[PDB]
Write a protein that binds this ligand. Structure first.
Ligand SMILES: Cc1ccccc1-c1cc2ccc(C(=N)N)cc2[nH]1
Ligand SMILES: [Ca+2]
Length: 223
């Protein structure tokens, strides 16, 4: 997260860190047994880490659970990142508490202008590199589809939306991938892609979760 702020320990209880010997992507807990992340975060040997703040220090409220199954969306296209969503089932159900909680799925799509909360452990520098230990946060509005498509001509599909600031300075980044974009208490987006980080007229691109609620619900119920 670039231009963001330190969230505060466990203030985003649904935020998860995917670890394969190191943090490589974020995710969102949608119920005690399932996590939603980005398809481009797919990899073998994933351990889900819940209740995390400083990912390099065991602070006492964490739960480390191995993934038993990963399901990448059937239509995911790695070339274009269209349908960049994946489900991860935990080997054992997480113990839900104030620091480890699920985030509800949307019942409808959010409109442009709606303010959302984006979080993650990605790089915090627009130019250069610096990875934080604690969770970073960023409040950003959903941008109009016209402004989104104008920034990325011929790259935006109906399964994507942009959020952030066209002036630059605030944006998600490398390491935040797969993480949550919550608006009005619902998981509306997944950190997917963008051009560089916090660059002018190059807002972040997010997977439009509302288009996948039926798939998520049906897939979880059958697995
Ligand atoms: C597009 C891409 C190809 C290969 C590896 C990483 C990425 C990538 C992920 C990613 C996440 C977020 C952003 C952003 N500036 N909001 C940009 C990004 N860019
Ligand atoms: Ca920790």
């Amino acid at each position: 997260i670039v231009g963001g702020y330190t969230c505060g320990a466990n203030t985003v209880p649904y935020q998860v860190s995917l670890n394969s010997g190191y943090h490589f992507c974020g995710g969102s807990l949608i119920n005690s047994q399932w996590v939603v992340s980005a398809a481009h975060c797919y990899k073998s040997g994933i351990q889900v880490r819940l209740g995390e703040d400083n990912i390099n220090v065991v602070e006492g409220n964490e739960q480390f659970i191995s993934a038993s199954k990963s399901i990448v969306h059937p239509s995911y296209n790695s070339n274009t990142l269209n349908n960049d969503i994946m489900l991860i089932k935990l080997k054992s159900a997480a113990s839900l508490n104030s620091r480890v909680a699920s985030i509800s799925l949307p019942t409808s799509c959010a409109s442009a202008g709606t303010q959302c909360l984006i979080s993650g452990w990605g790089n915090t520098k627009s130019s250069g590199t610096s990875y934080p230990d604690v969770l970073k946060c960023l409040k950003a509005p959903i941008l109009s589809d016209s402004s989104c498509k104008s920034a990325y001509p011929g790259q935006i599909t109906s399964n994507m939306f942009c959020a952030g600031y066209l002036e630059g300075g605030k944006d998600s980044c490398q390491g935040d991938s797969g993480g949550p974009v919550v608006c009005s208490g619902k998981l509306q987006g997944i950190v997917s892609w963008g051009s560089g980080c916090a660059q002018k007229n190059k807002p972040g691109v997010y997977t439009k979760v509302c288009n996948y609620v039926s798939w998520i619900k049906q897939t979880i119920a059958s697995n």
